[model samples]
Target: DRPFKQRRSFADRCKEVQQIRDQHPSKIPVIIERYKGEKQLPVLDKTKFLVPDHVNMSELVKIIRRRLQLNPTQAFFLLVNQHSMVSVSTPIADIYEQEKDEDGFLYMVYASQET
Candidate 1:
């Protein structure tokens, strides 16, 4: 379950995303991971995604729902980084613009079955 973070130097990270910036302005680079304390939700098959600019967080939630076969009543929480909760009604493009890391990826974490 190792992520790409801490695996590259600052300059390397900058070099990587500089190309990513030029590659596709239509898609937001995303990296989703499970919250460490979570026990209910399964880890996604992948962590990286190129999400479309047009989709809102609700639609992306559906993407994860279908990925994990989550039932309609299932409950989970998604976070921007580890602190802030994002609005499901908001488009990911604006969120990405506000929250994207210096390396050009929107880092998200998810948790479920919180008490």
Candidate 2:
């Protein structure tokens, strides 16, 4: 038999939101370091910028590509804190909260797959 269920309390949602807010600030300092074959792009070595913590990895990648004037067909991989490789669907907030170093920088390394 099916049973009736009620929605979660507003307080619970608020608490969750508060937790996320505590972990992630409104603006995050991002450091993107070029790696492997990506060195030839416009901005080399590293690029620093501030972005909303809620931005998704795909959007971040797009922004970087635009800034570097990279071709849309280029292939690349992104690493977080120089350790974990993240997918395009990953959220900047999650990566920042989990891997931010003592300097308060969310490190992202980009390795290109271009031949």
Candidate 3:
């Protein structure tokens, strides 16, 4: 009988990588820093939120708005590291993975008006 050969393809390698990434902690704590112009939302001015690693930027924004009782007309922005403007579709986990501090917490800056 001929020896069987096993070779991994690109897709298989990618899947392996994904599985490794998925092994990261599901819930990551994020610290939200509200800018001076931000409104004083109940339990939000100086608080932390635990979010799933897969949470998208827009999803977090909606959650914040709901918690703060913001109107539809109200606008706010979330910035990464006080500089990078993240897209709504971007995953927060990526940010945490890239910029989490020694406390294992991701930092985000929020403002009522775009800064």
Q: What is candidate 2's lDDT per residue for 19-101, written digit by digit as tens? A: 54576558676657666345544444346566786788778777666666667776665666455353457677777767775
Candidates 2 and 3 compared by lDDT, better number: 3
RMSD of 1: 2.5
Worst 10 residues of 3 by lDDT: 1-10
At residue 96, give the lDDT of candidate 3.
Answer: 70
Please give the TM-score that candidate 3 achieves against the real structure: 0.62
Question: Which structure is stronger by lDDT: 1 or 2?
Answer: 1
What tens digits encode model 3's per-residue C-alpha lDDT throughout 1-115? 1111124454654454345446644766666666645564333544556678788877887676677676777666666666535456767777676777544556676776665
Model 3 alpha-carbon miss at residue 27, Å? 0.6
Ranking by TM-score: 1, 3, 2
What TM value does model 2 have?
0.59
Q: For each candidate, what TM-score against the reference? A: 0.79, 0.59, 0.62
- Candidate 1, 1-115: lDDT as tens digits: 7665766676876676666668876887887888878788888898878887888887786677678777777787777755435346778887886798887778888788433
Question: Scored by Cα lDDT, where does model 3 land?
Answer: 0.61
Residue pairs with backbone atoms closer than 3 Å in model 3 (clashes): none
Better of 1 and 3 by TM-score: 1
